[PDB]
Amino acid sequence: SKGEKLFTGVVPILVELDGDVNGHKFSVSGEGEGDATYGKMSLKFICTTGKLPVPWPTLKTTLMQCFARYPDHMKQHDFFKSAMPEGYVQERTIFFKDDGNYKTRAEVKFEGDTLVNRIELKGVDFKEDGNILGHKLEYNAISGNANITADKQKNGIKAYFTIRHDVEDGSVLLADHYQQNTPIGDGPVLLPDNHYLSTQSKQSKDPNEKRDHMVLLEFVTAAGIPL
């Protein structure tokens, strides 16, 4: 593959998510730009159905690892770009400790020059008064590592990592992520050695936006293989 050449400049991003958590339906739309040369995404997300029924932080990892910066010495390990433009399916189960889980499925692919991430999400078994449905999480940035491994049986990758969400009472809500990605096309892909993606995030609000929303500035770098 030569998917990597699709990412050498600034790429427009479109994100769509339809969710259902304990029967509470909602939609999110996002836009921005990616500049994988610097690992950068600049994004704004809006809840298009009114108020979001779960906290924005719990949806961040669901709402494009193809924009990571792979150092030159690790370019052979970039599955995500190698699958483009036809794209990949990204599926996760996220288990929130002592609460419910999200199951997500997304297709990430080019539609012309725009990188589009379409997502459904279903959440079940949430506590109606817990830290999620009760909106008890701090609106703060999520940074950290996603561990990537090859999944040769599926001609893709798996990933795993735990997000530590800050709760307003000073505790932490652990979100244990299990991820599987598979190419949509039948062209060749890169199957990587073990490595991780490190994400540095800045999260904010747009003072002129009246809709329920989240603004993000993300930098994502591949690491874990020296040189």
Side-chain angles (χ1 to χ4, degrees):
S1 182
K2 58 182 167 315
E4 120 211 305
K5 304 178 192 324
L6 300 170
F7 292 88
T8 57
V10 174
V11 173
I13 289 169
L14 180 67
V15 182
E16 288 180 333
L17 177 143
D18 290 323
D20 178 332
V21 178
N22 280 28
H24 301 285
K25 295 173 149 208
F26 63 94
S27 301
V28 171
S29 63
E31 293 185 12
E33 310 189 314
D35 200 353
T37 296
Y38 310 99
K40 179 181 177 179
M41 293 174 294
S42 179
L43 300 160
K44 179 175 171 180
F45 296 97
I46 302 288
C47 178
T48 61
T49 47
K51 282 280 161 224
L52 201 60
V54 294
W56 282 109
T58 70
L59 297 186
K60 194 251 182 157
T61 56
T62 296
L63 293 165
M64 295 170 286
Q65 290 167 320
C66 51
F67 287 108
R69 182 180 71 89
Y70 277 72
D72 172 75
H73 81 277
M74 292 181 62
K75 301 301 195 173
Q76 67 271 36
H77 295 116
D78 189 348
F79 163 83
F80 303 106
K81 297 184 187 56
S82 78
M84 299 290 171
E86 301 83 1
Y88 56 78
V89 177
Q90 174 159 306
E91 289 165 299
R92 298 206 178 97
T93 304
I94 304 171
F95 293 96
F96 294 99
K97 173 78 171 158
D98 296 323
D99 210 338
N101 61 265
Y102 296 163
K103 289 184 174 71
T104 69
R105 182 185 185 280
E107 291 186 15
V108 185
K109 71 177 75 78
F110 278 89
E111 296 282 358
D113 288 333
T114 294
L115 187 287
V116 180
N117 179 21
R118 294 196 212 185
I119 312 153
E120 0 154 16
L121 176 158
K122 181 86 173 310
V124 296
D125 297 340
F126 288 87
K127 292 170 174 175
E128 272 292 340
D129 49 3
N131 293 150
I132 294 169
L133 290 175
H135 294 276
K136 308 189 195 183
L137 300 183
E138 300 268 17
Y139 187 75
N140 53 30
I142 287 167
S143 300
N145 300 334
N147 299 107
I148 310 303
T149 194
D151 186 352
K152 186 170 183 169
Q153 190 170 0
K154 299 313 184 352
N155 204 32
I157 62 85
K158 294 212 117 163
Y160 62 90
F161 53 95
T162 295
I163 299 300
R164 300 176 60 83
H165 293 293
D166 288 330
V167 188
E168 63 186 17
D169 62 9
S171 66
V172 166
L173 168 60
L174 304 176
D176 189 12
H177 287 59
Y178 296 85
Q179 178 182 333
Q180 155 91 59
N181 293 37
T182 62
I184 291 169
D186 46 51
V189 298
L190 299 170
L191 301 174
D193 292 345
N194 288 0
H195 68 280
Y196 64 96
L197 303 181
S198 172
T199 295
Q200 187 273 328
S201 173
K202 183 184 93 184
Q203 181 162 148
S204 55
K205 298 286 193 193
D206 178 348
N208 301 133
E209 180 58 66
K210 296 187 191 174
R211 298 168 289 177
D212 196 0
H213 76 283
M214 172 170 71
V215 174
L216 290 179
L217 172 63
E218 306 299 289
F219 294 89
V220 184
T221 313
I225 297 172
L227 295 174

